Amino acid sequence: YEFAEKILFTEEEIRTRIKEVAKRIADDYKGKGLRPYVNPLVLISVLKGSFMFTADLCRALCDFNVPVRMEFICVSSYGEGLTSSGQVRMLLDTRHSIEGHHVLIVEDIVQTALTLNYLYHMYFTRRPASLKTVVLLDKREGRRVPFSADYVVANIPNAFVIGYGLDYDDTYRELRDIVVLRPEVYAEREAARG
Amino acid sequence: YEFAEKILFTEEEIRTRIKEVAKRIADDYKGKGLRPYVNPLVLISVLKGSFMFTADLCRALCDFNVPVRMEFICVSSYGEGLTSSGQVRMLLDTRHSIEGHHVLIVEDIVQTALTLNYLYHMYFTRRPASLKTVVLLDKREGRRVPFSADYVVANIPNAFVIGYGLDYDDTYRELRDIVVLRPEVYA
Ligand SMILES: O=P(O)(O)OC[C@H]1O[C@H](OP(=O)(O)OP(=O)(O)O)[C@H](O)[C@@H]1O
Ligand SMILES: O=P(O)(O)OC[C@H]1O[C@H](OP(=O)(O)OP(=O)(O)O)[C@H](O)[C@@H]1O
């Protein structure tokens, strides 16, 4: 990748970690007696970024016999930029009610936690049986509001990461690996956009 | 897979065919001058079934250096027996305009093509540079309106398939494989 300063995680590494994480989620939900049709774990995929993690994670969950039901929502905050707008926009909410169900929000990354905080305060009022979160990437020290995800695949530095669903101006989401975008690349774009 | 009467395609077989299709798409757009930011191949993933096919496809397209832009759309029925035309309510449309861009709609399966045909025409009226569709499975004999997909991973008969994004009552989308639902289950 010419635009990458460096590769954080290759596809195999990501695959390996998602497996371990799905195994834990399976052990943790064993006592809930999740079952298809009547008691699936509701996975809430936060678009656009969570699309790839969600696809690979539901399969790893399936490997461990954890029955799921997918809900796709869409929330926007960064837009074409590199930093939080300070605003979280709900572009698409769940199709069904989460009341009484075990819900697990699936996110690609958490930084300021404005997004997950907005989501949690919205969904908690809906009375789900339980509400947890799994984030592929966590920038621990980037919080503007506190938030502790239930499952973190990896902690990372505050630099701008792309690939595997993560974008910079709706680009690079397709990469198989997670990489650090060179500031010179995004700066040229930010400039051209300005 | 106790709930399945038969295995259609294993994860491996699916994986291989998507690569072939992706190489095809790549070659077909070789002269179109695709570039990130300014001229990407816009993928319009039709939720919810194509979510898995799209994740794998965009990565396959990436293997062939085809720069893509992911869009996800969510549609809904207006209310049963209200349209012949396959008209659907748009709950979520493309974030950017497709006008002037090369567009590829991504679907998991097409049978009646009622909705896919409506979606196709809709985006067509938005004046994209080009518009094609890629569907994972094609039940060619089930059409209720004429429609051809430009790229197809596999043609299949009218069996009820599940897995790899495809569901039966919102169940089984997470399977790595595509299998046929036991009629005993769907009864
Ligand atoms: O913790 P925060 O600071 O809120 O940052 C995390 C959010 O920002 C990104 O989404 P974005 O708003 O860019 O939307 P996207 O998923 O469509 O790319 C990321 O995918 C998270 O949803
Ligand atoms: O060509 P057709 O005869 O319409 O059949 C195929 C279409 O319908 C199904 O989606 P569904 O309505 O089940 O939505 P979903 O993808 O969210 O499951 C399937 O996912 C395709 O969209």
Ligand SMILES: Oc1ncnc2cn[nH]c12
């Ligand atoms: O590094 C990063 N890459 C992509 N999106 C975001 C959001 N927060 N920080 C990001």
Ligand SMILES: Oc1ncnc2cn[nH]c12
């Ligand atoms: O066989 C099939 N499996 C899953 N969804 C659909 C849509 N049309 N036909 C289907």
Ligand SMILES: [Mg+2]
């Ligand atoms: Mg996001």
Ligand SMILES: [Mg+2]
């Ligand atoms: Mg983003």
Ligand SMILES: [Mg+2]
């Ligand atoms: Mg569908």
Ligand SMILES: [Mg+2]
């Ligand atoms: Mg369906």
